[PDB]
Design a protein around this nucleic acid. Structure first.
Ligand code: SF4
Ligand SMILES: [Mg+2]
Ligand SMILES: [Mg+2]
Ligand SMILES: [Mg+2]
Ligand SMILES: [Mg+2]
Ligand SMILES: [Mg+2]
Ligand SMILES: [Mg+2]
Ligand SMILES: [Mg+2]
Ligand SMILES: [Mg+2]
Ligand SMILES: [Mg+2]
Ligand SMILES: [Mg+2]
Ligand SMILES: [Mg+2]
Ligand SMILES: [Mg+2]
Ligand SMILES: [Mg+2]
Ligand SMILES: [Mg+2]
Ligand SMILES: [Mg+2]
Ligand SMILES: [Mg+2]
Ligand SMILES: [Mg+2]
Ligand SMILES: [Mg+2]
Ligand SMILES: [Mg+2]
Ligand SMILES: [Mg+2]
Ligand SMILES: [Mg+2]
Ligand SMILES: [Mg+2]
Ligand SMILES: [Mg+2]
Ligand SMILES: [Mg+2]
Ligand SMILES: [Mg+2]
Ligand SMILES: [Mg+2]
Ligand SMILES: [Mg+2]
Ligand SMILES: [Mg+2]
Ligand SMILES: [Mg+2]
Ligand SMILES: [Mg+2]
Ligand SMILES: [Mg+2]
Ligand SMILES: [Mg+2]
Ligand SMILES: [Mg+2]
Ligand SMILES: [Mg+2]
Ligand SMILES: [Mg+2]
Ligand SMILES: [Mg+2]
Ligand SMILES: [Mg+2]
Ligand SMILES: [Mg+2]
Ligand SMILES: [Mg+2]
Ligand SMILES: [Mg+2]
Ligand SMILES: [Mg+2]
Ligand SMILES: [Mg+2]
Ligand SMILES: [Mg+2]
Ligand SMILES: [Mg+2]
Ligand SMILES: [Mg+2]
Ligand SMILES: [Mg+2]
Ligand SMILES: [Mg+2]
Ligand SMILES: [Mg+2]
Ligand SMILES: [Mg+2]
Ligand SMILES: [Mg+2]
Ligand SMILES: [Mg+2]
Ligand SMILES: [Mg+2]
Ligand SMILES: [Mg+2]
Ligand SMILES: [Mg+2]
Ligand SMILES: [Mg+2]
Ligand SMILES: [Mg+2]
Ligand SMILES: [Mg+2]
Ligand SMILES: [Mg+2]
Ligand SMILES: [Mg+2]
Ligand SMILES: [Mg+2]
Ligand SMILES: [Mg+2]
Ligand SMILES: [Mg+2]
Ligand SMILES: [Mg+2]
Ligand SMILES: [Mg+2]
Ligand SMILES: [Mg+2]
Ligand SMILES: [Mg+2]
Ligand SMILES: [Mg+2]
Ligand SMILES: [Mg+2]
Ligand SMILES: [Mg+2]
Ligand SMILES: [Mg+2]
Ligand SMILES: [Mg+2]
Ligand SMILES: [Mg+2]
Ligand SMILES: [Mg+2]
Ligand SMILES: [Mg+2]
Ligand SMILES: [Mg+2]
Ligand SMILES: [Mg+2]
Ligand SMILES: [Mg+2]
Ligand SMILES: [Mg+2]
Ligand SMILES: [Mg+2]
Ligand SMILES: [Mg+2]
Ligand SMILES: [Mg+2]
Ligand SMILES: [Mg+2]
Ligand SMILES: [Mg+2]
Ligand SMILES: [Mg+2]
Ligand SMILES: [Mg+2]
Ligand SMILES: [Mg+2]
Ligand SMILES: [Mg+2]
Ligand SMILES: [Mg+2]
Ligand SMILES: [Mg+2]
Ligand SMILES: [Mg+2]
Ligand SMILES: [Mg+2]
Ligand SMILES: [Mg+2]
Ligand SMILES: [Mg+2]
Ligand SMILES: [Mg+2]
Ligand SMILES: [Mg+2]
Ligand SMILES: [Mg+2]
Ligand SMILES: [Mg+2]
Ligand SMILES: [Mg+2]
Ligand SMILES: [Mg+2]
Ligand SMILES: [Mg+2]
Ligand SMILES: [Mg+2]
Lengths: 57, 276, 96, 208, 82
RNA sequence: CCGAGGGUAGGGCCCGUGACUGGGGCGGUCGUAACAAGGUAGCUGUACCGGAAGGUGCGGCUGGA
RNA sequence: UUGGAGAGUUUGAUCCUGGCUCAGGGUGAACGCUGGCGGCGUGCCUAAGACAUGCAAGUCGUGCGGGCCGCGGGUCCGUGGUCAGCGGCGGACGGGUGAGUAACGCGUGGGUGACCUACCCGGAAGAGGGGGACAACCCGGGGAAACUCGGGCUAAUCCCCCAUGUGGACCCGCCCCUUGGGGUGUGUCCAAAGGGCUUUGCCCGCUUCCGGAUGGGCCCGCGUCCCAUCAGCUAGUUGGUGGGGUAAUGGCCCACCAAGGCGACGACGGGUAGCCGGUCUGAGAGGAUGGCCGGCCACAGGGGCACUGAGACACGGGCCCCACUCCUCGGGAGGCAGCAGUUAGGAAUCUUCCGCAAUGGGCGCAAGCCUGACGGAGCGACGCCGCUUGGAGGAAGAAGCCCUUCGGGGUGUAAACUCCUGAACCCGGGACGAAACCCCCGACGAGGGGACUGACGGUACCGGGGUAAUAGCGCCGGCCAACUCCGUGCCAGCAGCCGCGGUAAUACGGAGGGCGCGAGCGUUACCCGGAUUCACUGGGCGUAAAGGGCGUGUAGGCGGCCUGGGGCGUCCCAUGUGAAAGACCACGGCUCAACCGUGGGGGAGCGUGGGAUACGCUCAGGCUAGACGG
């Protein structure tokens, strides 16, 4: 689960793309933010795409 | 997401009825919708993407006044609650206007003992809490009628608002109501979005214990002005003097929070429980 | 719940009926001829296979036999009646 | 579509004057004449030695920027030159010179190629009589780049014509002034122009 | 039977048929026997009809049949004018 | 006569799973086998032995003296 | 001779080996943030799971007899509507899908003396007589339905018998021919149908034959994925003689007899897949792939069967079994892998739209009728191509924000302002796509003449009028283009690989600035690329991974010098085939382009014919330098 803070928990419906984390062995997939019960990240301005965050005003 | 309303249906006591349309104010069943769950806002393709107020009321009832203590290690507690307020949407980290400080709202004595347990022992933060949790509201029992003047035709630099509203008790649990029946134009078109804000901040501090006032109706029906000395921040201070005063008028009542409670106990202590 | 497809079907019951019928007599008669050549019985055999020959092409007139089939049907009927008669000749009347 | 936005900054990034603006270009109010150094917080900073990559990068950028064209059409053109018979570096330059919004420029009907586009697009220009409003038209030799005669009555076209009485156009062009029309006689030769583009480099770049 | 027909090619809003000989029962733009002319019925060019009249006479002689609006074009550039 | 398939009985291959058990990979306790003649040169096939590395026998190799 | 870039990472350092990782192109995509216009394509990749409703094959009153409504009136008769019925042609095409299939299924080239082909085009011959059945309709039972049943009446282009025999079909013989090919002879066998108009005649039908044309069946060489930790397989098995079956060959089927047939050149078995034209990648060789369009196969809920027929073992025909689900207690109905559409499953895939104007198909003399083929419209940045968010001018240079040595430096001509154009909208007009079928003169032919018909669509486009009119996403340690402050302090986090973070972080978060792309930008998944890292082009084995412990020899591979024959390999020329689309090059069409038309150029590879003879092959003769022997 990528980024700072997350809203995920037991029974969260979730979407996953592949791609592993080097240091976290066994972990071979990534949770895609802003989809299903995965939140995007609040207060994220740069790279919003990679973090499922909508644009500010 | 776009969606394609195929057929449109009505339901009778014995048969289904296809209809070619559903006019506003009415209702019926629409075939064809795919990813549209209940409690959603369907607009037309070329229409204001507004979202109707479906699925509502949060809503917290216990406030513990956490002071950031000392003093420049402040903004790290504000970076703790922030991630917290994304991990848990219920609670509000509201700020008090007069006293200026931050306030952790919640859903029970316990909701703050699991947060401000982790808030100290799962970050760090030099900060501390009292506190009670006094979370009452205020409302009115009878309707009354005052004036919202701001007669400062001086300085030449702004300062004039005059306001007249009928404030009546609403059904409890209902919250706010604002009907805008200005007639003639005796208050200009650009003094409405800031006489409403002139009211909506006046209810923020109450007349007995000083707590948010809900369950009211504010009918704006009259008021004068001075085109030269009338400022937008003169009807915004006008409606604060009428609302914080008309609520003092017609019987202001502390409403108070109440919990439905499911207590599980062995059959032996029942009476010991109940009678307590 | 439709069609004059069924009209095509009723039309096939009568059609198969006449073919079956025709095709039956053919076999019956042909076998009968060949049976008579197996004893011979010179005159009788041909007499039959003559009537048999007839029923063969006549069936092939309609949608019952191919001409080649009627051709085979005729071929062997003759080859068998004849070869059979080679045991005791007297091949009168006519089909040789 | 086409870039839009701050364009002094292009040239001063490019270390070289391009004629992207119009009148100001020749004036000493050009920012390049004043700040011949890369835009942004690190402009006057003792630059670090380019990489062969940087080198071929920048050469490509300037060459496209010069014509104010999409990275995709530029590349599109370039691959076609490579397919086409004979020298690729030249045929490229030739092919992107044959583009209607640019022809209108050499012929001086307008100041910048930027300004030019808008003319062609609005219908103010034509080719061989019939009106043509696409900045991409392959101007094929033998052609009549007239003004839309029904939009000759205008303050800007005359004006740029006013300023084009006797400058010698391209060796491949025949600006009959007054009559508001030129002719694309033959597609340019290599030496037939000297912009600051080392064309051999744009080639080596796209061959990575 | 075998036929002389208009196989459509070209784009949408660009009819460019191919007057062609095929078996009655192919898909219209399906595999024919022989091509014997074109026909841009929109006439966006000089030669919008081209019938190899030599071949158009052969197929007719062996037995081919033609679309009623194929002779419209076979006749127009005359195949029958003795 | 054959015949969809049903039934009966016996086999072959595959998959998943199983109390329990064997090692295998990744992140304190005992010794110190290897790396310098590594403090008994090292390795080796095999054999027997030993908490563990390992030791010992027989023969081999030098990538050792 | 239009064609070929590499980098980071093992060490203290080096060289080599070697794996990993990355920049590229591509997609029936999909996910994030963002999203204005148009063109052309294109869109259930998963459950060939289940499907409500509407539609998707019908047509001929110029084949025939009938039942109501009418219409000129003398319950009569003629007509034309109309529902069926009998009869004919179609329904085997067209559309869908890739489950099954490693196969003569497909590709490519051939064989058929082993055969078929409705309608369409030639050529030859004919239509003489006679009889007969069934529906329809009238009548008589059951069902809460499908509907059926017994009796009688009856028309025909329905049915059958006699006849004529151009001709054809079979047996035996004979001549030619050589797998059952053509001709002849004697015996036997077999044709048929009428309707219509303007009526000594034209027209649309039928009949037997031969030929064509087109579409097929069957057969053969050669090519087609993985596992040998699948090594042996086979009893209709392999051949035979006879017969049955077919349009036809054949163990295709049956009886008998013979003991075969296949297999390391991979049988048998297991996995997996519809094949090709092509498509994507690549310097090529090669690798990967088969969506859409075209070509062939295969399947129509799962199965089996045959009827009818030119043709099917028949998607929207029939029968039987099964599974599921529907209509009331006997019995019934269903089959979207047609067009839409529902549902389920899924990361994901559309309108229950318009039209038969065009093109094509079926029937019909025609008028015409049916056509979810098709022609178009709708939705989706799915993809490609076209465009827009403005253009010239404007300060040694506002404000705000960022940095700073506190002088400044930057955003930045950028903006505000100055004029100029003028996407959207507003008014007007407004299409080609459609000349044939049909009527007339000629002759129902040639040719001439005229009329009706447009869904898209009052849309494109043209004319006038006319508003400054969306910008977003990725990245800025190195590969790799783009650098500073602040916050944080091995936390929080980044991450493709090296790795960054433990208080001064160009690597984490934000800001400014920069780089890069722009109605898109990133990400995931997969293919080829880089990978000369399966090496034919184009690698290797002393010590890096890698010489079998060592012999003997089977198959296989390879093999000296000279001369003759052959011409199999090899080389050359001619010729056929190598469909269309694509690719390529030129020219053109839609304002360009995408897209789209016409033209050109062909290869490989196979068939046929000719030639060459060096090398390889093969046969014959010779040698002695290899080898063996005394
Ligand atoms: S040259 Fe002068 S005007 Fe032309 S772009 Fe560079 S700075 Fe702007
Ligand atoms: Mg939850
Ligand atoms: Mg949920
Ligand atoms: Mg019998
Ligand atoms: Mg027949
Ligand atoms: Mg039959
Ligand atoms: Mg036979
Ligand atoms: Mg104008
Ligand atoms: Mg390249
Ligand atoms: Mg059985
Ligand atoms: Mg069984
Ligand atoms: Mg059973
Ligand atoms: Mg087991
Ligand atoms: Mg030791
Ligand atoms: Mg030791
Ligand atoms: Mg030792
Ligand atoms: Mg040692
Ligand atoms: Mg030992
Ligand atoms: Mg022990
Ligand atoms: Mg011991
Ligand atoms: Mg020893
Ligand atoms: Mg070693
Ligand atoms: Mg490279
Ligand atoms: Mg390293
Ligand atoms: Mg090492
Ligand atoms: Mg190191
Ligand atoms: Mg390497
Ligand atoms: Mg890059
Ligand atoms: Mg490359
Ligand atoms: Mg499918
Ligand atoms: Mg696929
Ligand atoms: Mg249905
Ligand atoms: Mg009828
Ligand atoms: Mg399949
Ligand atoms: Mg297999
Ligand atoms: Mg084969
Ligand atoms: Mg073959
Ligand atoms: Mg038929
Ligand atoms: Mg007779
Ligand atoms: Mg046999
Ligand atoms: Mg036989
Ligand atoms: Mg068999
Ligand atoms: Mg047998
Ligand atoms: Mg035997
Ligand atoms: Mg399988
Ligand atoms: Mg399959
Ligand atoms: Mg290569
Ligand atoms: Mg296909
Ligand atoms: Mg099946
Ligand atoms: Mg199904
Ligand atoms: Mg079936
Ligand atoms: Mg079935
Ligand atoms: Mg039929
Ligand atoms: Mg079939
Ligand atoms: Mg069937
Ligand atoms: Mg169906
Ligand atoms: Mg059918
Ligand atoms: Mg469907
Ligand atoms: Mg659907
Ligand atoms: Mg779902
Ligand atoms: Mg569609
Ligand atoms: Mg039509
Ligand atoms: Mg038609
Ligand atoms: Mg339709
Ligand atoms: Mg688009
Ligand atoms: Mg999208
Ligand atoms: Mg200055
Ligand atoms: Mg400044
Ligand atoms: Mg300053
Ligand atoms: Mg400007
Ligand atoms: Mg028209
Ligand atoms: Mg006449
Ligand atoms: Mg109009
Ligand atoms: Mg259109
Ligand atoms: Mg205009
Ligand atoms: Mg502006
Ligand atoms: Mg980038
Ligand atoms: Mg760099
Ligand atoms: Mg922290
Ligand atoms: Mg980042
Ligand atoms: Mg440090
Ligand atoms: Mg720092
Ligand atoms: Mg980075
Ligand atoms: Mg940073
Ligand atoms: Mg574009
Ligand atoms: Mg790869
Ligand atoms: Mg390779
Ligand atoms: Mg390797
Ligand atoms: Mg590898
Ligand atoms: Mg090699
Ligand atoms: Mg190697
Ligand atoms: Mg090994
Ligand atoms: Mg080794
Ligand atoms: Mg050895
Ligand atoms: Mg040998
Ligand atoms: Mg040899
Ligand atoms: Mg030799
Ligand atoms: Mg040869
Ligand atoms: Mg071709
Ligand atoms: Mg052109
Ligand atoms: Mg061509
Ligand atoms: Mg010899």
């Amino acid at each position: 689960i990528p980024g700072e803070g997350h809203n995920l928990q037991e029974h969260s419906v979730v979407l996953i793309r592949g791609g592993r984390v080097k240091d976290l062995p066994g972990v071979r997939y990534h949770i895609v933010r802003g989809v299903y019960d995965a939140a995007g990240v609040k207060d994220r301005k740069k790279s919003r795409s990679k973090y499922g965050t909508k644009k500010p005003k | 997401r776009k969606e394609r309303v195929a057929r449109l249906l009505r339901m009778h006591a014995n048969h289904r009825e296809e209809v070619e349309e559903l006019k506003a104010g009415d209702l019926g069943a629409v075939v064809g919708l795919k990813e549209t769950i209940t409690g959603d806002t369907l607009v037309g393709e070329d229409a204001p993407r507004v979202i109707l107020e479906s699925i509502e009321v949060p809503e917290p009832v216990i406030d513990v006044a956490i002071e950031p203590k000392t003093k420049a290690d402040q903004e790290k507690l504000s970076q703790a609650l922030a991630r917290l307020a994304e991990e848990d949407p219920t609670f509000r980290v509201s700020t008090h206007p007069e006293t200026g400080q931050t306030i952790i709202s919640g859903m029970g004595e316990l909701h703050l003992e699991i947060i401000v347990d982790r808030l100290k022992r799962e970050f760090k933060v030099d900060a501390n809490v009292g506190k009670p949790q006094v979370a009452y509201r205020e409302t009115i029992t009878k309707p009354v009628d005052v004036e919202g003047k701001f007669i400062r035709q001086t300085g030449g630099r702004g300062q004039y608002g005059h306001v007249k509203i009928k404030v009546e008790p609403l059904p409890r649990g209902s919250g706010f109501e604002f009907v805008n029946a200005i007639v003639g134009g005796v208050i200009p078109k650009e003094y409405i979005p800031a006489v409403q804000k002139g009211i909506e901040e006046a209810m923020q501090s109450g007349p007995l214990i000083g707590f948010p006032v809900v369950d009211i109706k504010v009918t704006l029906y009259d008021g004068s002005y001075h085109e030269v000395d009338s400022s937008e921040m003169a009807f915004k201070i006008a409606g604060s003097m009428a609302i914080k005063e008309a609520v003092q008028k017609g019987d202001p009542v502390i409403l108070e929070p109440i919990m439905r409670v499911e207590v599980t106990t062995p059959e032996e202590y029942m009476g010991d429980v109940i009678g307590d | 719940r439709n069609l004059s497809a069924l009209k095509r079907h009723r039309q096939s019951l009568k059609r198969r009926l006449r073919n079956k019928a025709k095709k039956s007599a053919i076999k019956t008669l042909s076998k009968k001829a060949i049976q008579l050549a197996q004893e011979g019985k010179a005159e009788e055999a041909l007499k039959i296979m003559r009537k048999a020959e007839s029923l063969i092409d006549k069936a092939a007139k309609g949608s019952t036999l191919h001409k080649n089939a009627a051709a085979r049907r005729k071929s062997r009927l003759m080859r068998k009646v004849r070869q059979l008669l080679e045991a005791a000749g007297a091949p009168l009347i006519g089909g040789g | 579509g086409r870039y839009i936005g701050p364009v002094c900054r292009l040239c001063r990034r490019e270390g070289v004057k391009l004629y992207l603006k119009g009148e100001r270009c020749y004036s000493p109010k050009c920012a390049m004449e004043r700040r011949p150094y890369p835009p942004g917080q690190h402009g006057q900073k003792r630059a670090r030695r380019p990489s062969d990559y940087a080198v071929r990068l920048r050469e490509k950028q300037k060459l496209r920027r010069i014509y104010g064209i999409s990275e995709r059409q530029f590349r599109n053109l370039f691959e076609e030159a490579s397919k086409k018979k004979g020298v690729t570096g030249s045929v490229f330059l030739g092919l992107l010179e044959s583009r209607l919004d640019n022809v209108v420029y050499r012929l001086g009907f307008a100041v910048s190629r930027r300004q030019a586009r808008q003319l062609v697009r609005h219908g103010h220009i034509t080719v061989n009589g019939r009106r043509v409003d696409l900045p991409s038209y392959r101007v094929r030799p033998g052609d009549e780049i007239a003004v839309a005669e029904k939009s000759r009555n205008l303050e800007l076209i005359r004006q740029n014509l006013e300023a084009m009485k006797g400058r010698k156009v391209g060796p491949w062009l025949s600006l009959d002034v007054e009559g508001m029309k030129g002719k694309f006689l033959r597609l340019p030769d290599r030496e037939d122009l000297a912009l600051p583009v080392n064309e051999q480099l744009v080639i080596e770049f796209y061959s990575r | 039977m075998v036929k002389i027909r208009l196989a459509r090619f070209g784009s949408k809003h660009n009819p460019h048929y191919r007057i062609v000989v095929t078996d009655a029962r192919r898909k219209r733009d399906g595999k024919y026997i022989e091509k014997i002319g074109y026909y841009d019925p929109r006439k966006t060019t000089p030669d919008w009809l081209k019938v190899d009249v030599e071949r158009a006479r052969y197929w007719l002689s062996v037995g081919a049949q033609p679309t009623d609006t194929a002779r419209r074009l076979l006749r127009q550039a005359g195949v029958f004018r003795q």
